[PDB]
Subunit: 230 residues, 2 copies
């Protein structure tokens, strides 16, 4: 019963920031206009800059964006929001700030009660039960890896198994397989750049032109393509 | 500009050079730093996909020709007494989060740090190099378990980013390594991050932390362009 748009990344090569997300958002808004933006993953730009940028790209869709860090009452802003938008950046800082401010549970409940959730990269991580499949660096301790638990599977965004020539460090699949040792019940979706999962009207729909990979404990990786229903 | 470092550390970026055997490039470094030491305790907890017995036996086998006797801390009767009596503490690669989680849960983190401060040789590669730093905030590993705190052994005062490379797959739009490091420098602007490439190491001996290995090392500090360093540099 939830409405989610989970993008692997913000920008296709040669396209504008979030350009490819606009028609997917447009199709899912279903009349919604009031959005709260969660900027906390952003580290190297200010949250005001991040919010203005998000407001700018969504304005032609009719969406009104409010940055949650600039309202007096963030709980009431989330409560009245029709759309919750969670930007990319560092996943640990995103989760840490969301938990410290007491926003994690209100965000999840607002989405469960009907609000549209849009997240890309780090914001796709946050929608999963935990952030255990992020690729980000642990620059801050989020005091727990549990996240919004809006999508039941673990998404690994920016998925690629390519490595630089001669690299001897862990491959992406090797890192995921280690997670499957410690948490053997999990399904990990290797969601490549360019792809997304859109949960709407009772269906979780894989989208994007690139091959998606599913990892489960003890099973060879499974290739999926756009149109798969989870 | 580090002051005198009183610990004996060997911090390897990685275990295996291309075309070489596991730890092959480390053997002359270990041998020449042993300084008469023979008794080693191996910390296997980073290993996920191999058993800690297998990991320990592999480590014991490869170091036995150096005269080093290896026991795995997970199978000794008394892990606190084993650390106290160890001449060498060896921390293997694997998942850094699990390594730190197990070390903390078992109450070994402080005894390991204290034994090294009191004279023991510390050898770590990859995850074991991360663990020697004040925190694991510069690991490249995936957070597969929560270690209940990112503070680590604090034996080496600077942050090591092992396996350092700024190269990315064709067309990739995700964060570059330097960008991930620059974000850490926003939240912790006092830090020095050493981009330690594969093949390289940091050896702390006779009071000096000396860079080793044939590849270029890059140092990142807040608001400063990356600095290129080569073998022989003293931190």
């Amino acid at each position: 019963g939830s409405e989610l748009l989970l993008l692997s990344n913000s920008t296709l090569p040669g396209k504008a920031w979030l350009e490819h997300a606009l028609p997917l958002i447009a199709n899912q808004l279903n009349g919604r206009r009031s959005a709260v933006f969660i900027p906390f993953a952003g580290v190297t730009q200010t949250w005001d800059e991040y919010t203005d940028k998000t407001a700018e790209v969504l304005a032609p869709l009719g969406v009104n964006v409010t940055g949650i860090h600039r309202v007096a009452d963030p709980l009431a802003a989330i409560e009245k929001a029709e759309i919750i938008i969670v930007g990319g950046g560092n996943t640990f800082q995103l989760l840490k700030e969301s938990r410290e401010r007491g926003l994690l549970a209100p965000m999840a409940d607002r989405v469960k009660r009907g609000a549209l959730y849009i997240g890309w990269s780090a914001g796709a991580n946050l929608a999963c039960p935990t952030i255990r499949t992020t690729n980000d660096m642990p620059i801050v301790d989020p005091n727990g890896f549990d996240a919004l638990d809006l999508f039941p599977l673990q998404i690994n965004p920016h998925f690629t198994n390519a490595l630089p020539e001669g690299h001897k460090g862990e491959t992406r699949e090797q890192r995921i397989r280690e997670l499957l040792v410690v948490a053997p019940e999990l399904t990990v979706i290797g969601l490549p750049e360019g792809n997304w999962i859109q949960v709407s009207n009772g269906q979780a729909v894989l989208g994007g032109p690139n091959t998606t990979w599913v990892f489960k404990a003890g099973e060879e990786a499974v290739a999926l393509e756009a149109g798969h229903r989870f």
